[PDB]
Design an enzyme around this catalytic site. Structure first.
Site, PDB file in Angstrom:
ATOM      1  N   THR A 223       0.814  -1.278   0.079  1.00  0.00           N
ATOM      2  CA  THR A 223      -0.061  -0.083  -0.030  1.00  0.00           C
ATOM      3  C   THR A 223       0.700   1.411  -0.085  1.00  0.00           C
ATOM      4  O   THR A 223       2.098   1.186   0.531  1.00  0.00           O
ATOM      5  CB  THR A 223      -0.978   0.142   1.235  1.00  0.00           C
ATOM      6  OG1 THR A 223      -1.764  -0.902   1.360  1.00  0.00           O
ATOM      7  CG2 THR A 223      -1.590   1.288   1.287  1.00  0.00           C
ATOM      8  N   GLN A 224       0.361   2.319  -0.653  1.00  0.00           N
ATOM      9  CA  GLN A 224       1.168   3.467  -1.026  1.00  0.00           C
ATOM     10  C   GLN A 224       0.384   4.674  -1.336  1.00  0.00           C
ATOM     11  O   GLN A 224      -0.820   4.420  -1.229  1.00  0.00           O
ATOM     12  CB  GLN A 224       2.097   3.198  -2.172  1.00  0.00           C
ATOM     13  CG  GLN A 224       1.261   2.188  -3.387  1.00  0.00           C
ATOM     14  CD  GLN A 224       2.503   1.838  -4.427  1.00  0.00           C
ATOM     15  OE1 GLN A 224       2.953   0.737  -4.274  1.00  0.00           O
ATOM     16  NE2 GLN A 224       2.756   2.845  -5.619  1.00  0.00           N
TER      17      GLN A 224
ATOM     18  N   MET B 177      -1.575  -6.387  -2.110  1.00  0.00           N
ATOM     19  CA  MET B 177      -1.902  -5.307  -1.277  1.00  0.00           C
ATOM     20  C   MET B 177      -0.549  -4.258  -1.714  1.00  0.00           C
ATOM     21  O   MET B 177      -0.325  -3.564  -0.836  1.00  0.00           O
ATOM     22  CB  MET B 177      -2.091  -5.557   0.015  1.00  0.00           C
ATOM     23  CG  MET B 177      -3.419  -6.344   0.225  1.00  0.00           C
ATOM     24  SD  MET B 177      -4.867  -5.306  -0.119  1.00  0.00           S
ATOM     25  CE  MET B 177      -4.735  -3.991   0.847  1.00  0.00           C
ATOM     26  N   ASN B 178      -0.335  -4.037  -2.972  1.00  0.00           N
ATOM     27  CA  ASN B 178       0.811  -3.410  -3.340  1.00  0.00           C
ATOM     28  C   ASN B 178       0.689  -2.941  -4.781  1.00  0.00           C
ATOM     29  O   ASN B 178       1.282  -3.261  -5.733  1.00  0.00           O
ATOM     30  CB  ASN B 178       2.108  -3.890  -3.124  1.00  0.00           C
ATOM     31  CG  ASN B 178       3.164  -2.956  -3.518  1.00  0.00           C
ATOM     32  OD1 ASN B 178       4.262  -3.668  -4.007  1.00  0.00           O
ATOM     33  ND2 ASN B 178       3.327  -1.653  -3.515  1.00  0.00           N
TER      34      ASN B 178
END
Lengths: 141, 233
Positions: free
Chosen positions: B1-2, B107-108
């Site tokens: 996540t970002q 999740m990235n």
């Protein structure tokens, strides 16, 4: 005594590695291939023995490309050559990923060299049954 | 996540009788700072495909390098790399779609919205969307970000269903695209006047146009606007 030519990494009493010398015999047995350096490039050529009329002409390609600027050709055990080129391609991609620039041919030559040399260091692998001729153009010629 | 830092806004596209058009401006924003003005967000792949990318620019550059590697890898041990076994738009897309969904599933995400425009070997138009969620869809017109809200309505007036495609020309399609870029320059606060436009035509090939500007703008009426209700002068 004797038996020095049965394992790969073993030095004979005169300092030789007989398993590498036997690998050379596999190359000497193979098809003839060449390379010619010209004044702004390189040329590669190879003999493809037509065993029969059943071989489709112009297919069964032997010369291989690495990145977009390097050509490789080899004589001996063809599969060993492919294995080497696969490594070369992995190796050239890595160089480009980190350093952006396409891999220079001297840099690329050592990458193959270090890998082939590694296969003379242990008895759990056998040496490569090919001599590979390769090259291309980079920043300085 | 970002979170996205340097960003590209709308990418807009539509198909016409003989191919597809795709456009995107040359801006890399940094929040509300209009930071970079020479950013190319259209990525051509070979002579038959253009990938337009919005969202995080660091990820766009990563995707850019993936596409160059695909071309290289495809040419390995491939005598027909510039003929029958050249990369199709559909292959480029399916690869990207796979990556986008795997990254969201880790999740990235690659924090982007992507439009792959092109022409397949059989002559068919290719136009398909994919984004950070791995969501894919095709439509006669496609757009990302603000382009979805403002460009699609205008582009859909030209090509409203599949049957409007053979009736629509390059000239009419291009004009509609160019008009939409002007509208986005009016109302999108993260847009630039300078943009690139790419046409992929089954006959005339890839036509890439750089350094385009929004022209023929209406502003003169602004002089008559004074106050916010009751003020006269």
């Amino acid at each position: 005594g004797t038996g020095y030519d049965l394992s790969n990494s073993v030095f004979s009493p005169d300092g030789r590695n007989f398993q590498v010398e036997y690998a050379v015999k596999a190359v000497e047995n193979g098809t003839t291939s060449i390379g010619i350096k010209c004044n702004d490039g390189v040329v590669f050529a190879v003999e493809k023995l037509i065993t029969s009329k059943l071989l489709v002409p112009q297919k069964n390609v032997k010369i291989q490309v690495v990145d977009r600027h390097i050509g490789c050709v080899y004589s001996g055990l063809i599969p060993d050559g492919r294995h080497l080129v696969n490594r070369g391609r992995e190796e050239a991609a890595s160089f480009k990923k980190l350093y952006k620039t396409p891999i220079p041919i001297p840099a690329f030559a050592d990458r193959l060299g270090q890998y082939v040399q590694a296969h003379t260091l242990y008895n759990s692998v056998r040496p490569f049954g090919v001599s590979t001729i390769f090259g291309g153009v980079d920043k300085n010629g | 996540t970002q979170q996205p830092i340097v960003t590209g806004t709308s990418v807009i596209s539509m198909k016409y009788d003989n191919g597809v058009i795709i456009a995107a401006d040359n801006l890399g924003s940094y929040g509300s700072l209009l930071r970079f003005n020479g950013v190319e967000r259209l990525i051509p792949v070979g002579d038959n495909t253009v990938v337009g990318i919005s969202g995080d620019i660091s990820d766009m550059q990563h995707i850019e390098r993936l596409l160059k590697d695909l071309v290289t890898e495809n040419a390995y041990d491939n005598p027909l790399a510039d003929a029958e076994e050249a990369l199709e738009p559909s292959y480029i897309f399916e690869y990207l779609a796979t990556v986008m969904y795997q990254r969201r599933s880790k999740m990235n995400p690659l924090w982007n919205a992507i439009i792959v425009a092109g022409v397949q070997s059989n002559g068919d138009q290719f136009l398909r969307y994919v984004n950070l969620l791995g969501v894919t869809y095709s439509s006669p017109t496609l757009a990302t970000g603000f382009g979805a809200h403002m460009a699609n309505p205008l582009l859909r007036k030209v090509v409203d269903r599949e049957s409007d495609i053979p009736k629509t020309t390059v000239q009419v399609a291009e004009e509609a695209i160019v008009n939409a870029m002007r509208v986005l320059y009016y109302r999108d606060a993260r847009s630039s006047r300078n943009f690139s436009l790419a046409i992929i035509d089954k006959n005339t090939g890839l036509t890439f146009k750089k350094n385009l500007q929004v022209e023929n703008m209406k502003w003169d009426f602004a002089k008559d606007i004074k106050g916010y209700g009751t003020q006269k002068i």
